[PDB]
């Protein structure tokens, strides 16, 4: 049971290199099943889900190898089943369905029981495929999709915005006969990245990033080299580590345009920011941050995924700031942990009222949420004394060796194994 021991306070400054987005890497990895020729997916982070996906792919008969890049050769897919033994701890598994039936005419994916830690419906995916002409077979714990020949482009109106189903429908539509129009498509920068990857392979797709995605099917996709986009939330997490520590940081391998709202929010906090084609610079000038008002909402507005981070910023800022969750419920569970560190806050309705204090005090903390947990480490860096962040495996799930990045920024951090 790994833990993080942090010695504070320490100013976080210097350089950090941003890892690729797991969330853009996953769907691209699955989409590669469409590729007739070898493919090189660069900038893929070293995370658990990537491994599971690697195993899943190999199981299909795909040739797979990795380092910074992941090499894929899907020329010989022979097996069409994603056994219960894989879709286990990985929702993303579902992404194998579409490419399979779209390219091979048949695909089968395992589905966790009606109520076993993942009763999460995948109805949208299924119905989207059916809409594209796939024959669907459901028996409960398994889902089969098949088609005689090619899938057929369709005008598909989404009743619920879904990053997951948008990927499934868009991916499968590239090999279908005709044009597919996806109304109410998810807008995520990850969707854009996946669409771009598809286009690099020879697909015809437009509207990515808007409410409307249009795909014109082609007979086949080739191979090539594609670089996965920068991790927007990781970038944001680092920018915040600098903004709460009076530091100066430059984020390398970054993508400014996927962070507009977070940047303007940082500026409101008093931060000095500059951006280039592939980098972002933040400078606090030794200054404490100014309390800010935050309203999370659908991309391209302020991302709920940066919430815990900004909550921490407000907590050590000059003045009072309120964070409102306009879409999600129960997103403040971690706050008590911060209060144990000396923070002043009130949780009311879909909001957290932040009364900034001068300095935090170290303590033994723990959060299950990826973002909130990472935030506890950030706090540990600026708090006075020793802070022990427990159960950090949650962080390792979406953060590529974060202790090493922090360290290179000046943090006094230690990965403590066993106990």
Ligand X SMILES: O=c1ccn([C@@H]2O[C@H](COP(=O)(O)OP(=O)(O)O[C@H]3O[C@H](CO)[C@@H](O)[C@H](O)[C@H]3O)[C@@H](O)[C@H]2O)c(=O)[nH]1
Token pair 């006969």 is at which residue? 177
Q: Minimum Å distance from CB 257 to ligand X? A: 21
- Residue closer to ligand X by CB (options 69, 168) is 168
Binding of ligand X by 114 (CB under 6 A):
no
- Residue closer to ligand X by CB (options 168, 309) is 168
- Residue closer to ligand X by CB (options 72, 122) is 122
Task: Candidates 29, 122, 294, 323: give the one binding ligand X (CB under 6 A).
Answer: 122
Residues 327-386 that bind ligand X (CB under 6 A): none
Binding of ligand X by 145 (CB under 6 A):
no
Packing angle, helices 232-243 and 260-268, rounded to 10: 10
- Beta-sheet strands, E only, within 115-223: 135-138, 142-146, 155-157, 179-183, 204-206, 212-216
Q: Supply the Cα-derived Rg of the chain in whole angstroms.
A: 22
- 170/22 Cα distance (integer angstroms): 19
- Residue closer to ligand X by CB (options 122, 173) is 122
Collapsing DSSP to helix, strand or coil, 111 comes out as coil
Q: Minimum Å distance from CB 316 to ligand X? A: 28
Which helix or strand (DSSP H or E) is residue 250 part of? Answer: strand 248-252
- Residue closer to ligand X by CB (options 123, 346) is 123
Binding of ligand X by 123 (CB under 6 A):
yes
Task: Candidates 3, 11, 103, 125: give the one binding ligand X (CB under 6 A).
Answer: 125
CB atoms within 10 A of CB 419: 6
- 367/359 Cα distance (integer angstroms): 21
Q: Minimum Å distance from CB 168 to ligand X? A: 8
Binding of ligand X by 121 (CB under 6 A):
yes
Q: Which residues of 21-33 are buried (b: 16+ CB within 10 A; e: fewer)?
A: bbbbbbbbbbbbb
Residues 151-190 that bind ligand X (CB under 6 A): 160, 162-165, 186
Distance from chain centroid for Cα 64: 23
Q: Minimum Å distance from CB 100 to ligand X? A: 17
Residues that bind ligand X in the complex, under the rule CB under 6 A: 91, 120-125, 160, 162-165, 186
């Amino acid at each position: 049971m790994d833990k993080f021991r942090v010695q504070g306070p320490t100013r976080l400054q210097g350089e950090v290199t941003i890892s690729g987005a797991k969330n853009a890497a996953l769907p691209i990895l699955f989409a590669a099943l469409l590729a007739e020729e070898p493919v090189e997916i660069q900038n893929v982070p070293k995370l658990k889900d990537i491994d599971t996906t690697m195993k899943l792919l190999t199981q299909l008969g795909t040739k797979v190898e990795r380092x910074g890049s992941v090499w894929i050769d899907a020329s010989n897919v022979n097996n069409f089943s994603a056994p219960y033994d894989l879709v286990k701890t990985m929702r993303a598994s579902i992404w194998a369905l579409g490419p399979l039936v779209a390219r091979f005419g048949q695909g089968q994916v395992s589905l966790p029981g009606g109520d076993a830690i993942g009763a999460r419906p995948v109805d949208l995916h299924i119905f989207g495929l059916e809409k594209l002409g796939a024959e669907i077979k459901l028996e409960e714990g398994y889902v089969k999709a098949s088609v005689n020949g090619r899938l057929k482009g369709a005008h598909i109106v989404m009743d619920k915005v879904s990053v997951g189903a948008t990927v499934t429908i868009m991916s499968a539509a590239t090999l279908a006969e005709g044009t597919t129009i996806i109304e109410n498509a998810a807008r995520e920068p990850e969707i854009v990245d996946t669409a771009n990857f598809l286009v690099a392979l020879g697909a015809k797709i437009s509207g990515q990033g808007t409410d409307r995605i249009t795909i014109e099917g082609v007979e086949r996709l080739g191979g090539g080299v594609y670089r996965v986009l920068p991790d927007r939330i990781e970038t944001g997490t680092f920018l915040v580590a600098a903004a709460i520590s009076g530091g100066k940081i430059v984020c390398r391998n970054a993508q400014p345009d996927t962070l507009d709202a977070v940047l303007a929010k940082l500026r409101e906090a008093g931060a000095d920011i500059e951006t280039g084609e592939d980098w972002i610079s933040l400078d606090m000038h030794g200054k404490r941050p100014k309390a800010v008002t935050v309203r999370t909402a659908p991309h391209p507005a302020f991302p709920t995924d940066m919430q815990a981070q900004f909550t921490l910023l407000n907590l050590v800022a000059e003045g009072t700031g309120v964070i409102t969750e306009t879409i999600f419920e129960n997103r403040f569970m971690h706050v008590p942990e911060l209060i144990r560190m000396g923070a002043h806050a009130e949780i009311e309705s879909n909001t957290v009222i932040c009364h900034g204090v001068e300095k935090l005090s170290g303590a033994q903390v723990m959060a299950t949420d990826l973002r909130a947990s990472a935030s506890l480490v950030l706090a540990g860096c600026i708090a006075e004394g020793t802070t022990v962040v427990d159960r950090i495996y949650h962080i390792d799930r979406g953060y590529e060796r974060i202790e090493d990045k922090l360290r290179a920024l000046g943090a006094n951090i230690e990965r403590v194994k066993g106990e």
